[PDB]
Amino acid sequence: EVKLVESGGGLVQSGGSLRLSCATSGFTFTDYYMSWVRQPPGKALEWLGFIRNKANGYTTEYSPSVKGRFTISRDNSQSILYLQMNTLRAEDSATYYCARDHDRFSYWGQGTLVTVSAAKTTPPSVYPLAPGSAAQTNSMVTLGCLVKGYFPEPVTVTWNSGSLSSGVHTFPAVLQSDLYTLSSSVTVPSSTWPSETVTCNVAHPASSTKVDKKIVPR
């Protein structure tokens, strides 16, 4: 199978520099153009540039928005595509994708996240959301987890390691001050909690932090 795997994304300060990689396999790398495309959170796709194939001497083009500032290159022995990004600004924060191109059997990487900011890597505070102690029941009960004050994105949340997925809603993170907050809710039958355990599993790879918060009554 054709695979494209991006890496090298992360948090960097304004004015900083970063090098993205896209390791490829399952096709003859040198036959294809390769493009970089980016998407700021909740925004449109923006094409950044490409590097051509061997028949076209691996020449490059760039959109006006990054021309002179970003450099695409490729290592043809190991079949890896690079994007060198210089003098970064907040507007460059986005998910960056590599895509096979040529000049279509179509193939994009999963994307790598770049965040340009003065805020620092911070693990989340994870708070259990259980009904108030003077709350009265019924057949279903809704619990939640509040994931507050972390940076950068992303965080992932599961409930009982995935087994409760059908009644789960995890809400997109929002920036406040300059930290992220999200929440996630889960609905289960009133008969199953608190008789059985409900735990929200929160992972924040950027800070190397995973937290399991059991939701207890009160």
Partner: protein, 218 residues
């Protein structure tokens, strides 16, 4: 640089209906020597990479359903989806590859369904959060339709607007509903000085708001 304009920005339709969306380029995309229009359509679902549906204006990518049809020439192009399914929920982008590449701004496709009222639940600050000096009150509004909804917070009967953070999910794939989280953040000192906290959801499914409350004196 070639400018790509998509219309409309968004649209909504019920399953089984047809939709058309339009893409216009600032100049012709017809290659004289291949006689092809270098216009492609992409589909992007939430949390995923874009997927190629159509290239050369009307050629369908391998394994794309026949209900997706691209057409048009020169500077005016059309994507038609016949028999819309729930899983076609996505943002659709056109892209020219006639000179460099550029994406249109996207057309968001939302699914119509029967109106549904939110299930509302409220949660007081966790004891954990209070130890840190902060106090967040959370309200979940789950599984409603349509998306338009208003939440209001009251503290001892008095409306409060600063410190409120709202986040909506993407339209659910399983049932086509939306859900929303509303979080009121206060200082612990503030929280401790008031007793009654209310979140009120106004939605077109009822003329009376759905209200949830808790009273610290209880």
């Amino acid at each position: 640089d070639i400018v790509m304009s998509q219309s409309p920005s968004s649209l909504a339709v019920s399953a089984g209906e047809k939709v058309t969306m339009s893409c216009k380029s600032s100049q012709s995309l017809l290659n004289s020597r291949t006689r092809k229009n270098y216009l492609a359509w992409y589909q992007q679902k939430p949390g995923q990479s874009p997927k190629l549906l159509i290239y050369w204006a009307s050629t369908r990518e391998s394994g794309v359903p026949d209900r997706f049809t691209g057409s048009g020439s020169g500077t005016d192009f059309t994507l038609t989806i016949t028999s819309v399914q729930a899983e076609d929920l996505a943002v659709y982008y056109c892209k020219q590859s006639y000179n460099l590449r550029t994406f249109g701004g996207g057309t968001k496709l939302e699914i119509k369904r029967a109106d549904a009222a939110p299930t509302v639940s409220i949660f007081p600050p966790s004891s954990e959060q209070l130890t840190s000096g902060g106090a967040s009150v959370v309200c979940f509004l789950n599984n409603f339709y349509p998306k338009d909804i208003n939440v209001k917070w009251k503290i001892d009967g008095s409306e409060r607007q600063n410190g409120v953070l709202n986040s909506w999910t993407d339209q659910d794939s399983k049932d086509s509903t939306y859900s929303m989280s509303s979080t009121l953040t206060l200082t612990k000192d503030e929280y401790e000085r008031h007793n009654s906290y209310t979140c009120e959801a106004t939605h077109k499914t009822s003329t009376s708001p759905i209200v949830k409350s808790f009273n610290r004196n209880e």
